């Protein structure tokens, strides 16, 4: 019941690729006596003053739980980060999606290498296609949107597919 700090990710993707950048933001209160913020990764201290924490080039070991605190805003609930290996990754900002909420997906390439002829698939079927990599944005989620999703695109002269992700439409 003591007030808590809150972690936010910028960008909001919690699944990222190696070499991606991640900014972690701490929402918490300060006072004239202390304006410091502490960051924890897997419950170990990684930063003791600055409000934000920047991961320049993510490694697999940067996966795990992140928490922050200020003196007035106590240790946040953890926020989970997954750093994956590979060339293509279907990114999502959160795990569960309620009906009528938007579904925002991105076919993300390693180092943001340019992607052409991009398909997002649901349960094995082409759902949306772009000649130039765009995000997948379902404005209003219906329960028919649940399924196994992956994406695929042409890198020069070689097609690559991401691994599948389970998208669940809840209430």
């Amino acid at each position, epitope marked *: 019941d003591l007030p808590k700090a809150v972690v936010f990710l910028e960008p909001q993707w919690y699944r990222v690729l190696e070499k991606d950048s991640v900014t972690l933001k701490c929402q918490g209160a300060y006072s004239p006596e202390d304006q410091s913020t502490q960051w924890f990764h897997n419950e170990s201290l990684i930063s003791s003053q600055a409000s934000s924490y920047f991961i320049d080039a993510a490694t697999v070991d940067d996966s795990g739980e992140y928490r922050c605190q200020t003196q007035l805003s106590t240790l946040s609930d953890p926020v989970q980060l997954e750093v994956h290996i590979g060339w293509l990754l279907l990114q999502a900002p959160r795990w569960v999606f309620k009906e009528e909420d938007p579904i925002h997906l991105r076919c993300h390439s390693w180092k943001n290498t340019a992607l052409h002829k991009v398909t997002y698939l649901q349960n094995g079927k082409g759902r949306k296609y772009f000649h130039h990599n765009s995000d997948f944005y379902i404005p209003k989620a219906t329960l028919k949107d649940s399924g196994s999703y992956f994406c695929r695109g042409l890198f020069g*002269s070689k097609n690559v597919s991401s691994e599948t992700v389970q998208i669940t439409i809840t209430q």
Partner: antibody
Amino acid sequence: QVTLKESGPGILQPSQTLSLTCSFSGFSLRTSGMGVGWIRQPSGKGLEWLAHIWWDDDKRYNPALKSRLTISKDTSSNQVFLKIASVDTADTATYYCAQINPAWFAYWGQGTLVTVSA
Amino acid sequence: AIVLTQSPASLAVSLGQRATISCKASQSVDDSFMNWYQQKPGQPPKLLIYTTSNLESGIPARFSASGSGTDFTLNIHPVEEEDTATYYCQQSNEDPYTFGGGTKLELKR
């Protein structure tokens, strides 16, 4: 970390079959996006891409080297092989293998000279 | 098949000056998978720039590159003694992968 070392016979006679081996470390050809390619360079000349093999066994070949080229891989032993058939003097060159990905060539090996002569 | 032509074919450069190498592609593809490699006489090529403008880690920032359609430009500034080498552009945009013919950079003293 990532290193590649080519091996050949040094010398082989014309019309024979060139066997080249690339042994690598620091990555695995099972990882999505990884490939191994072969490039050659006649002395004092430019570079000519020959062939490469992807992690999913997709194989691409220079359409000017007829059908003499055959590339294979071995995931267990971290090796890739290139066979050139019906060699002649114009095949003499340094042969490089390289770890590539769909957008660029990342690491090259030291290269091995192959002379085609009797 | 994409033809890459480098200009000049050879350059003599003074210590500390900017050196520019152009690589012109016969075909335009809307970043393009244009790569640059440095090859010192005894050694393999070594990656300098990947995907038109990205500096490979461990390479000094006096190497840089930019693309303007079919017009790709490598820039070395300042030029140092150890830059004497041949520089190659290369495209992975389409099969078959092709290289430029090379630009041979030599130092003055």
